[PDB]
């Protein structure tokens, strides 16, 4: 473990020096993203049954 | 002690790292989301059953076409299925019985798999001489293949019980980049949407993020109390979810450099084996060793629905790129589409 | 029913592992078995043109070994040297040492042609046969056929139904001898069938025990001059010995009809008896009951030494007890607490041969019960030699009937060779006595049930490989090979047109495969893999299985009088399995147990695969 503590120190030297953001901003954007893509999530917003391969679609290519 | 003289120094950085984050922790996602409407009882049903494997299913992965999927089983076979009809496209008998994982290349031209052979084997799905043949065996790891994902046809990333991950030039058949740091077997990896980054999750109960190109660990996320089994990227590329033996899923943010949210309940007592988000990221689907898959409101931490269709462990799942459907694989030997 | 039926070629998978675990897939071990030799022979002669000349050369030397005279050997040695030595050298096709070439040539130029002239070449042929060639043999059909044949052997369970009984031959103390044919091959044998009741009554359990043990110490090396054993087995009520058949009666019987024999006729019987005794004595057994009643005749009049029930093993622990018939025992034998070895038979032989010439034991002067006076004359009377006798005969008898072992013929020195070198036997060629070429003087005419005691008779059953393989080779071997080749050729042409299964065992990590049966019997084809046991009906792929993980244990058990494996499965569930043969049974047990213990050792190391709380 001689040079095991050496590289563990300088790994953290890197991990420490990134510029972080506030959580409220991070959560805000997460929330924003979901909201902007809710229309396009078929598990949240049903598509017509005839467009769904797993309910009523007939024609496939 | 030269090693002491750099151990407390490992602490005065591990504290400095807690500090900068605690300073950023001004609110919680649950507080920010406390206003928006609930998702409402997500009551999905089983729309297809895939029968064919003869023993436990350990892993599956959707093609980018949201139609074909590969599964991998204790029965020593990959099966590529067409979910729309239920037909099998290929049934691939493997050289080693002990496969644990499988992957589908974005192009649909290749599939990969591996297990205790410690090898990631790539299968050409369209041989010029119309056949399915092994086209490469990637050898280098000194432990078992636990997960793998193609960046493209000539590049793949692999996780392993030897504690490493690795990018491979498929042609050269070499590790173009190694990713060391983890102190326990690595169980899973997810590739960022831009495939410039990827996260990994390991039995050390930590998750890491890596620079695909520079080959370094940028950030290490902790909080779980036990093995991380599954890991999944949030669609926008700035967050990811993990599932643990500790009976919880957790959400981590890249730029906040910390955990936002924990999904658990006092009834849910066994480990998560698999996770992914729906297309919008609003839902987090997780698979359990209790035979169910729970559907969580990613934003509010509420349980939105359950998928109760399997008679043994739910071992894997995926959500189609088009968001149309979920696939659950199980130790009971069946996959179901929901 | 009666015909020998070989298992299918798929038996190779099970059988190869059985043999390999036992060290029996080596050139020495296979080459020196009769059927192994014959199958190795075909492979070299027909299917590899680099080993053709080697085996040809080998068989030509082996013919050479058996040439009777020195002149036949000058001619043949020269033919061999011409074809297999000089021509190959000129053809640059001679894979043999300079010393080999010179040993033979150096001898041949001096016209010295002993039967072992070509020994160095024998060892170098084996050297050239033993590597790549032997490996290519294993990789071929002919080893597949060896396995089929070996399978039948190691699964031999003899009963009475397997034989056909003709008529009686004699009676004895606890049982009787019979004439039998063996159904499958037709080979005629003698069946001695002693009864356990009478044995436990006379308390001669140590006797029957001795004979079976002495027989197996004797029944190797195809000796022409002892009645040898091919099998031994048991039934509810009796003990069988399947022995070499002799129909011509005994020399006691014939002495009485013919009367005393000439000096010339005794000689022939003596010659054959001496080679019998040489055989037993080289395997550390003294017969002890050498007498005319105990010598048997076949349809041509050649002789064999018969009942082994009083014979002794003198290798480890030397006998001292007086045993044998009274007018033939040795001074040492009668003496209380005195060790003796083979010396006993040499004295008895001298007694026995005098009886042929004179009608009575030398030491008996018509005394019936009185063993004592016989014994006292044995220990004082230097036997009186009639003037009728030749001086050659005289010294032979005087040599054999020495009272001290220190002097006797066949005792101090070199055994039977001292006898063979007597002037009495000086006309004989001993090679020719062995090969049975001397004409016989007489051709015979052509017209309280106990469950406890049963376990004393476990380890009685026995089959002598060497004996069984010769029976097969000389009878059914060629025709069954031809037949089961034809069977298989049509199996191939059937499968090729009925969508042949490109074998499901190939190109994976299958450990073993083969037929077995299972109730819930049902015959299915099984494939054992490192983490599971698949199985299938015919015309499909495996569509069900069992995992190494869910196997709790594997034991042998008994169903409807058969031996079958029992797997205890995780869910308190059971699984039962029949095999066709004892080797199959033994090998599945071992491989299943190996595989699940190793599989369950692995799964525990892998967090994704093992069970959780
Ligand atoms: C014409 C029959 C001569 N023969 C005897 C004679 N001995 C014999 C035949 C049948 C049963 C017993 C028997 O019960 N032996 C038990 C026994 C011993 F084992 C040792 C000493 C005394 C004794 F009574 C003994 N044993 N085998 C043969 C025989 C006959 C024809 N071909 C080949 N062998």
Short mmCIF file of C-alpha atoms and ligand atoms in Angstrom, two decimals, chain C residues 168-178 189-195 198-199 202 204 206-212 227-228 241 243-250 289 293-294 296-297 304-311, ligand 1:
data_model
loop_
_atom_site.label_atom_id
_atom_site.label_comp_id
_atom_site.label_asym_id
_atom_site.label_seq_id
_atom_site.Cartn_x
_atom_site.Cartn_y
_atom_site.Cartn_z
CA UNK C 168 -23.04 -84.30 -16.91
CA UNK C 169 -19.29 -85.04 -16.81
CA UNK C 170 -18.47 -85.89 -13.19
CA UNK C 171 -19.36 -85.51 -9.53
CA UNK C 172 -17.24 -84.20 -6.63
CA UNK C 173 -17.28 -83.50 -2.90
CA UNK C 174 -19.65 -80.50 -2.84
CA UNK C 175 -20.89 -80.45 -6.43
CA UNK C 176 -20.46 -81.59 -10.01
CA UNK C 177 -19.08 -80.71 -13.48
CA UNK C 178 -21.23 -80.28 -16.65
CA UNK C 189 -17.09 -74.84 -21.80
CA UNK C 190 -17.18 -76.96 -18.66
CA UNK C 191 -19.43 -75.69 -15.84
CA UNK C 192 -18.49 -76.75 -12.27
CA UNK C 193 -21.52 -75.92 -10.07
CA UNK C 194 -20.87 -76.32 -6.32
CA UNK C 195 -23.76 -75.97 -3.79
CA UNK C 198 -23.34 -78.75 1.24
CA UNK C 199 -20.34 -76.36 1.54
CA UNK C 202 -18.95 -79.83 5.29
CA UNK C 204 -15.43 -76.24 3.27
CA UNK C 206 -12.18 -72.01 2.81
CA UNK C 207 -11.90 -74.65 0.04
CA UNK C 208 -14.22 -73.16 -2.63
CA UNK C 209 -12.58 -69.83 -1.72
CA UNK C 210 -9.11 -71.27 -2.35
CA UNK C 211 -9.99 -72.69 -5.77
CA UNK C 212 -11.46 -69.48 -7.22
CA UNK C 227 -7.87 -76.50 -16.99
CA UNK C 228 -8.29 -72.75 -16.71
CA UNK C 241 -16.86 -72.00 -12.49
CA UNK C 243 -13.77 -73.75 -17.26
CA UNK C 244 -11.97 -75.15 -20.27
CA UNK C 245 -13.80 -78.24 -21.56
CA UNK C 246 -12.22 -81.72 -21.47
CA UNK C 247 -14.33 -84.66 -22.71
CA UNK C 248 -11.77 -87.50 -22.76
CA UNK C 249 -11.83 -88.70 -19.11
CA UNK C 250 -8.86 -89.00 -16.72
CA UNK C 289 -2.57 -83.22 -5.62
CA UNK C 293 -7.04 -89.10 -11.58
CA UNK C 294 -6.33 -85.35 -11.69
CA UNK C 296 -7.69 -84.93 -18.05
CA UNK C 297 -7.87 -85.77 -21.75
CA UNK C 304 -4.49 -80.90 -18.73
CA UNK C 305 -3.96 -80.77 -14.96
CA UNK C 306 -7.46 -80.37 -13.45
CA UNK C 307 -8.78 -79.96 -9.88
CA UNK C 308 -7.10 -76.92 -8.16
CA UNK C 309 -8.87 -77.28 -4.76
CA UNK C 310 -5.78 -78.33 -2.78
CA UNK C 311 -3.27 -75.95 -4.46
C1 LIG D 1 -14.68 -85.04 -14.63
C2 LIG D 1 -14.66 -84.03 -13.48
C3 LIG D 1 -13.22 -83.69 -13.06
N1 LIG D 1 -13.18 -82.30 -12.59
C4 LIG D 1 -13.09 -81.95 -11.33
C5 LIG D 1 -13.01 -82.89 -10.12
N2 LIG D 1 -13.26 -82.17 -8.86
C6 LIG D 1 -14.47 -81.74 -8.48
C7 LIG D 1 -15.61 -81.82 -9.30
C8 LIG D 1 -16.83 -81.34 -8.84
C9 LIG D 1 -16.94 -80.79 -7.56
C10 LIG D 1 -15.81 -80.71 -6.74
C11 LIG D 1 -15.88 -80.12 -5.31
O1 LIG D 1 -16.94 -80.08 -4.67
N3 LIG D 1 -14.71 -79.70 -4.82
C12 LIG D 1 -14.54 -79.14 -3.48
C13 LIG D 1 -13.15 -79.55 -2.98
C14 LIG D 1 -12.07 -78.67 -3.11
F1 LIG D 1 -12.28 -77.46 -3.66
C15 LIG D 1 -10.79 -79.01 -2.67
C16 LIG D 1 -10.56 -80.26 -2.09
C17 LIG D 1 -11.62 -81.15 -1.96
C18 LIG D 1 -12.90 -80.80 -2.41
F2 LIG D 1 -13.90 -81.69 -2.27
C19 LIG D 1 -14.59 -81.19 -7.21
N4 LIG D 1 -13.09 -80.62 -11.31
N5 LIG D 1 -13.17 -80.19 -12.47
C20 LIG D 1 -13.23 -81.19 -13.34
C21 LIG D 1 -13.31 -81.05 -14.73
C22 LIG D 1 -13.92 -81.98 -15.57
C23 LIG D 1 -13.93 -81.75 -16.94
N6 LIG D 1 -13.38 -80.65 -17.43
C24 LIG D 1 -12.79 -79.78 -16.61
N7 LIG D 1 -12.75 -79.97 -15.30
#
